[PDB]
């Protein structure tokens, strides 16, 4: 009917409202602050032990343990200070594209092409690691399992949906529908009240955890979105895409703030994560090297070229001590 | 230096031993991706092996362990998860021959073959092409001509010439002939003649992998 015309008029109204609340870009605002300088960070540790391409990693809230999953059928929980392997949990299905380490540290979730987020209970009796709960109900492929608490987990899949699973029941509480493409990433706000999902429709949507409905939708990318991460203040988030640029948005102004393109990089981004203060935006690329951007001046402030394959997972600790990048050459460098 | 960290490092070393042993065990295991069109003979191929989301079938043949990954269960954008299969031993492609009724499945199979044969990942992974359902294909071609799908087919309306035309028309889609070869085999309903062919077409890639890892070149 005319509802598509009405929707186009409404989107035009949204764009006009956004341009009515825009006065100066972030580059104009921060054109007077001094730059961060070159950020030379060396490889302190190197977590060797996986037998295939590493696709995910999530640091612990204690900023020491990190779980990383690879296609060799296993995800390994490393003591990053001493390069040890605290645990080596073998998967039921070797195809894994995500992993998470619970904030309390008791649980580890991981998911892949098996359409199940399997949650392992670490700090149990009997010494070994057992499946606490295998959450099934997606029809695509899980790209990001992320923990809210020990009992709630938000999983974004390839059926264009996110979901909020209650672990002890196993049934998903709220299903976040509204995307048109596969949802490739997910990132919780620091207060765990909202989150953002970036999908393959070049859009990042801000879902409300407690309600179950999207609040804001951010467009501006030309290609698929492979990564997303909240700014530590909680009122902004970067967005890594296949357009070879990260885009820093913001929630309160509901617009695009900054674009991080560069002529020397042409292939996409597989992982994005801010620093602790948020001034440095570390983005893992698929041209084998990570890039560290001065997120208030868009100047490429560092290069991390320790990998000889695609950097698939990037993670900055909560206290900001180090940034570990794991790639497809089975290595988890820990830069600092 | 180390107080319990000696025992932690010992646990890490035992974990390393288990990881290396499992890597040795699963590095000699043949991985076969299984792709194809909808409602095709893929399920028939899996049934003929003597044993939602991705499905893995394990079977031993000639004292060789094959994991065969039927991944077509999940319907999503293939470009975001096909790089997980960079490094499969072979790609068993499947084509139903006797289908022209969905709104033209053979053209869809050709599009899938063109899209999967020229990936940046699958340059060296050989493609084992299967052409299923020869009897129903022959009945269909004796019932309805090939001109409904390919107008430019010039020749007899018989089995042999049309089958060779379809086989060549699938093979020529590859733009890297020297890196990999399409081992096209007519599956039909033949029993114990398919797995031997899979073994024969996979031993060459295994020999190439042995040559690459042994350091000869």
């Amino acid at each position, epitope marked *: 009917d005319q509802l598509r015309q009405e929707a186009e008029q409404l989107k035009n109204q949204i764009r006009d409202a956004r341009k009515a609340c825009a006065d100066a870009t972030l580059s104009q605002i921060t054109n007077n602050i001094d730059p961060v300088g070159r950020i030379q960070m060396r490889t302190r540790r190197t977590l060797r032990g996986h037998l295939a391409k590493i696709y995910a990693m999530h640091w612990g809230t204690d900023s020491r343990l990190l779980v990383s999953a690879s296609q060799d059928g296993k995800l390994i929980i490393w003591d990053s200070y*001493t390069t040890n392997k*605290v645990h080596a949990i073998p998967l039921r299905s070797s195809w894994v594209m995500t992993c998470a380490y619970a904030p309390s540290g008791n649980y580890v979730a991981c998911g892949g092409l098996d359409n199940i987020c399997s949650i392992y209970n670490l700090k149990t009796r009997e010494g070994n690691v057992r499946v606490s709960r295998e959450l099934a109900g997606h029809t695509g492929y899980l790209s990001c399992c992320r923990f809210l608490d020990d009992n709630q987990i938000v999983t974004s899949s390839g059926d264009t949906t996110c979901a909020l699973w209650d672990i002890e029941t196993g049934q998903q509480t709220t299903t976040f529908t509204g995307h048109t493409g596969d949802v490739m990433s997910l990132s919780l706000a620091p207060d765990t009240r909202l989150f953002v999902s970036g999908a393959c429709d070049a859009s990042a949507k801000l879902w409300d955890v407690r309600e179950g409905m999207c609040r804001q939708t951010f467009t501006g990318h030309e290609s698929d979105i492979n990564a997303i991460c909240f700014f530590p203040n909680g009122n902004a988030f970067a967005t890594g895409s296949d357009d070879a640029t990260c885009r820093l948005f913001d929630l309160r102004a509901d617009q695009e703030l900054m674009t991080y393109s560069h002529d020397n990089i042409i292939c996409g981004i597989t992982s994005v994560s801010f620093s602790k203060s948020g001034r440095l935006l570390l983005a893992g690329y698929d041209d084998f090297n990570c890039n560290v951007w001065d997120a208030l001046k868009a100047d490429r402030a560092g290069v991390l070229a320790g990998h000889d394959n695609r950097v698939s997972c990037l993670g900055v600790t909560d206290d900001g001590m180090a940034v570990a990048t794991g790639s497809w050459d089975s290595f988890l460098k820990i830069w600092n | 230096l180390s*107080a*319990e960290d000696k025992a932690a490092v010992e646990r890490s070393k035992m974990i390393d031993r288990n990881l290396r042993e499992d890597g040795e065990k699963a590095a000699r295991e043949v991985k076969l991706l299984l792709l194809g069109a909808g409602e095709s003979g893929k399920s028939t191929i899996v049934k003929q092996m003597k044993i939602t989301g991705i499905v893995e079938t394990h079977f031993t043949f000639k004292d060789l362990h094959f994991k065969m990954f039927d991944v077509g269960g999940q319907r999503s954008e293939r470009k975001k998860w096909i790089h997980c299969f960079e490094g499969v031993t072979a790609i068993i492609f499947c084509v139903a021959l006797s289908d022209y009724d969905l709104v033209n499945r053979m053209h869809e199979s050709m599009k899938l073959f063109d899209s999967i044969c020229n990936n940046k990942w699958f340059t060296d992974t050989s493609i084992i092409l299967f052409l299923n359902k020869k009897d129903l294909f022959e009945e269909k071609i004796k019932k309805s001509p090939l001109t409904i799908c390919y107008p430019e087919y010039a020749g007899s309306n018989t089995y042999e010439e049309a089958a060779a035309y379809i086989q060549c028309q699938f093979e020529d889609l590859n733009k890297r002939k020297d890196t990999k070869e399409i081992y096209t085999h007519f599956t039909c309903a033949t029993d114990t003649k398919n797995v031997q062919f899979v073994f024969d077409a996979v031993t060459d890639v295994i020999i190439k992998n042995n040559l690459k890892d042994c350091g000869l070149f």
Partner: single-chain antibody
Amino acid sequence: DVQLVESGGGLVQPGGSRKLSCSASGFAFSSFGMHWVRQAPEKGLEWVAYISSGSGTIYYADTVKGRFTISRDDPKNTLFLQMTSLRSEDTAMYYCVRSIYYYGSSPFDFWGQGTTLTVSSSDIVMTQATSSVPVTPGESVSISCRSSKSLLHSNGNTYLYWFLQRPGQSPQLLIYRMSNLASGVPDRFSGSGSGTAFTLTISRLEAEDVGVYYCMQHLEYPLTFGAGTKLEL
């Protein structure tokens, strides 16, 4: 249903030989470093021996280094201590003790039932500040423990373990690395201290909480226990 049950022991002539064997029913035995720890009939605990996982590292107490040998059968989940030349001071109750060592683990978590063994006829000295303290239920009491050497290793954590042994019961882990409560103990207990002086503090005492409290060091082998502070209701 974690269950370590020992078997063997009993009466034996001095200088003879006897084999103890604890079956480990209910947990993943092969991942666990095991210990044998003995308790004299009216004395404190003494560490005897330790096997790592996979038997890659074995330690013995210097007193019994050579007269005892220790082994594990992982497929049948059993731990063996073959005792040779049983002298007069080996009459004791033996417990085989579970212990897993990773980051944030709780070694010495579980203690077996233990079997008695009656015969006929620089070590870090860990010392308890006393041997008995009067106590009433509902009162917070502090138990001190003194160490020969500073247990604060360079990596930050001090290796000291507080155990409680109920009368007629196997000891249970209470506190590991002087601050972390074991899985299954209430939040009453709290440990504190510097690298040398250590203190357990129990608040809001109950009836069944009385027993003998041992402080163990784990910085270096042998793992000398404490003399044992006892609480009487």
